Amino acid sequence: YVEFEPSDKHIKEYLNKIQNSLSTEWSPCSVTCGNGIQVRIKPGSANKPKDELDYANDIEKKICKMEKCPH
Ligand SMILES: [Pt+2]
């Protein structure tokens, strides 16, 4: 059945996109309408170099919901 949840592959793609602004503050929502994701570096991982961020443990993720997508 369709999951209707964001996928890890897609969240990782977003991480690539916003990597220059990635911080311990929540990122912008990945979408301007519908459902997307926001990500941030976990506060306890702020000291880590970019190349040692573990997806599961060092990155936090939350669903964000914008207004319905228009036709
Ligand atoms: Pt929104």
UniProtKB/Swiss-Prot annotation:
Protein location: Cell membrane; Cytoplasm
Lipid-substituted positions (GPI-anchor amidated cysteine): 69
Regions crossing the membrane: none
Taxonomic superkingdom: Eukaryota
Residue ranges of every copy of the TSP type-1 domain listed in the record: 17-69
Disulfide bonds: 29-64, 33-69
Residues that carry a glycan: 32
Biotechnology: CSP immunodominant B cell epitopes are primarily located in the central repeats. Antibodies against CSP and particularly against the central repeats can neutralize infection at the pre-liver stage and thus makes CSP an attractive candidate for the development of vaccines.
Post-translational modification: During host cell invasion, proteolytically cleaved at the cell membrane in the region I by a papain-like cysteine protease of parasite origin. Cleavage is triggered by the sporozoite contact with highly sulfated heparan sulfate proteoglycans (HSPGs) present on the host hepatocyte cell surface. Cleavage exposes the TSP type-1 (TSR) domain and is required for productive invasion of host hepatocytes but not for adhesion to the host cell membrane. Cleavage is dispensable for sporozoite development in the oocyst, motility and for traversal of host and vector cells. O-glycosylated; maybe by POFUT2.
Domain notes from UniProt: The N-terminus is involved in the initial binding to heparan sulfate proteoglycans (HSPGs) on the surface of host hepatocytes. The N-terminus masks the TSP type-1 (TSR) domain which maintains the sporozoites in a migratory state, enabling them to complete their journey to the salivary gland in the mosquito vector and then to the host liver. The unmasking of the TSP type-1 (TSR) domain when the sporozoite interacts with the host hepatocyte also protects sporozoites from host antibodies. The TSP type-1 (TSR) domain is required for sporozoite development and invasion. CSP has two conformational states, an adhesive conformation in which the TSP type-1 (TSR) domain is exposed and a nonadhesive conformation in which the TSR is masked by the N-terminus. TSR-exposed conformation occurs during sporozoite development in the oocyst in the mosquito vector and during host hepatocyte invasion. TSR-masked conformation occurs during sporozoite migration through the hemolymph to salivary glands in the mosquito vector and in the host dermis.
Protein family: Belongs to the plasmodium circumsporozoite protein family.
Entry function: Essential sporozoite protein. In the mosquito vector, required for sporozoite development in the oocyst, migration through the vector hemolymph and entry into the vector salivary glands. In the vertebrate host, required for sporozoite migration through the host dermis and infection of host hepatocytes. Binds to highly sulfated heparan sulfate proteoglycans (HSPGs) on the surface of host hepatocytes.
UniProt-recorded name of the protein: Circumsporozoite protein
Residues of the full protein shown: 310 to 374 of 397
